[PDB]
Design a protein around this ligand. Structure first.
Ligand SMILES: [Co+2]
Ligand SMILES: [Co+2]
Ligand SMILES: [Fe+3]
Ligand SMILES: [Fe+3]
Lengths: 275, 276
């Protein structure tokens, strides 16, 4: 039945303390400990499903970087994004002969700059997002916050393009989107409200798309190593452990948000698909 | 009641500023290998000489914490070194006030971190007041034979061997009137598993809130609030800081932070006097 494509949406760099909290602490014999600017991949997933095409995440906006870019300069220097034209999401979809108007459902894991970048392309889709994440992002917009992980100009475009929203409620059960495709309601942790995805493929079997609920394999452990970028510490831990249980009980792979080694291994959209 | 409140200097500690102020100086494209700093801060305790009986808030570090024969693990000693002359040790500070450990009726343990619960074992004639969630969490560290981290196995060992008398504050228990104008504040989860504070109403000085590690420094307090890297419950921490800010406003109280160097310098310490 379905076909699942991994699309390469370029690379981002940032302080590795964001990724792994207190990774290299200062000591009496190393009092001025230095950090490192680590590279990690930005990616999206397309599930070409009989019942309709499902897109997980949307990467960054093409108009994000540069002196005429949407991102504030402080954001550009703290979380720089590098991508060729081939990396842009509209192009990756074009090379698969898929038009934006063909996307039935977009699942926004959360509304950070590197996942919600291109929501505005999908004017014929239902956009699925946690309600707490939505509220949080809209407050950023209304309070006219121009820095941080929530891009004012992105949100501005969502409203102008008249996107059709479907909020997952705080205490809402998981949503069966299609045969073998479930939206997981992870709630608060990394951000205000996280969504994941469990995909059951005939040949490949079970896949959990965790997004920023688990950055990397180092995050996952055990033991768990939580990030510096975090809203609800307790929630974050509960979520990781919950994914570990689901993985075991359903014999599923766990696909992390930004794991460089794992990403290299993936079969990309320019080479083929999973089935 | 006409009490006297004393601030006692129990030495200094140093650690990565990222523990104290999370992501205080993040790396950027043009400064990729940004360095941190190793900041110094005070360790102190408060004595309330009250007519109904003497109350002690926190107990600093154990005299035999540091060194090759030290209770603290080497890794701990290197990340959180404590420097203190003999006169800084709690038992000496009390002596210089003609106070013996057996004179202490109540010990309020803000939490059970290495720099607050170090000297509980001295007070075998007191009721030790502690948050039940903090007490439980420390005991698990003990039972699991965890020898590294902020909860000192040898300290806990001694509390047990010395048969301390405990009184746990329950998770949803209200504030506890310990004496005229002395209330134990139940802050719950945040920096650690279970935080306690103290509100003190002095005739002359007025209101005082002892926050301990619920609020590290003035930099923590803001506004805006700047949370620590050393954090268990992030939401609870934020909730607690705003709660303290409210109480402070409504009761016209000063807020004494856990480890503010500037504020500590301005305090009248036990070698100079007290607060009435
Ligand atoms: Co994110
Ligand atoms: Co502490
Ligand atoms: Fe991300
Ligand atoms: Fe402390």
């Amino acid at each position: 039945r379905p076909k699942l494509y991994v699309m390469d949406n370029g690379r981002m760099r940032m302080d590795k303390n964001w990724m792994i909290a207190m990774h290299n602490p200062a000591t009496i014999h190393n009092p001025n400990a230095q950090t490192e600017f680590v590279e990690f991949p930005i990616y999206t997933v397309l599930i070409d499903h009989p019942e309709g095409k499902i897109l997980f995440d949307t990467s960054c906006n093409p108009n994000s970087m540069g002196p005429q870019g949407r991102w504030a300069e402080s954001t550009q220097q703290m979380f720089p994004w590098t991508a060729t034209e081939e990396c842009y999401l509209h192009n990756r979809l074009e090379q698969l002969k898929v038009r934006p108007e063909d996307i039935r459902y977009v699942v926004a894991s959360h509304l950070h700059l590197d996942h919600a970048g291109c929501l505005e392309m999908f004017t014929n889709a239902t956009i699925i997002v946690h309600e707490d994440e939505f509220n949080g992002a809209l407050q950023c917009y209304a309070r006219n916050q121009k820095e941080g992980a929530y891009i004012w100009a992105d949100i501005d475009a969502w409203i102008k393009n008249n996107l059709q929203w479907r909020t997952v409620k705080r205490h809402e059960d998981n949503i069966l989107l299609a045969e073998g495709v479930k939206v997981l309601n992870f709630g608060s942790g990394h951000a205000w409200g996280m969504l994941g995805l469990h995909v059951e493929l005939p040949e490949t079997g079970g896949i959990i798309l965790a997004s920023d609920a688990i950055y990397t394999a180092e995050s996952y452990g055990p033991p768990i190593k939580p990030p510096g970028m975090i809203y609800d510490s307790l929630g974050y831990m509960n979520t990781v452990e919950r994914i570990r249980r689901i993985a075991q009980e359903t014999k599923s792979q766990v696909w992390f948000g930004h794991d460089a080694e794992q990403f290299k291994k993936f079969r990309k959209s320019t080479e083929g698909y999973y089935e």
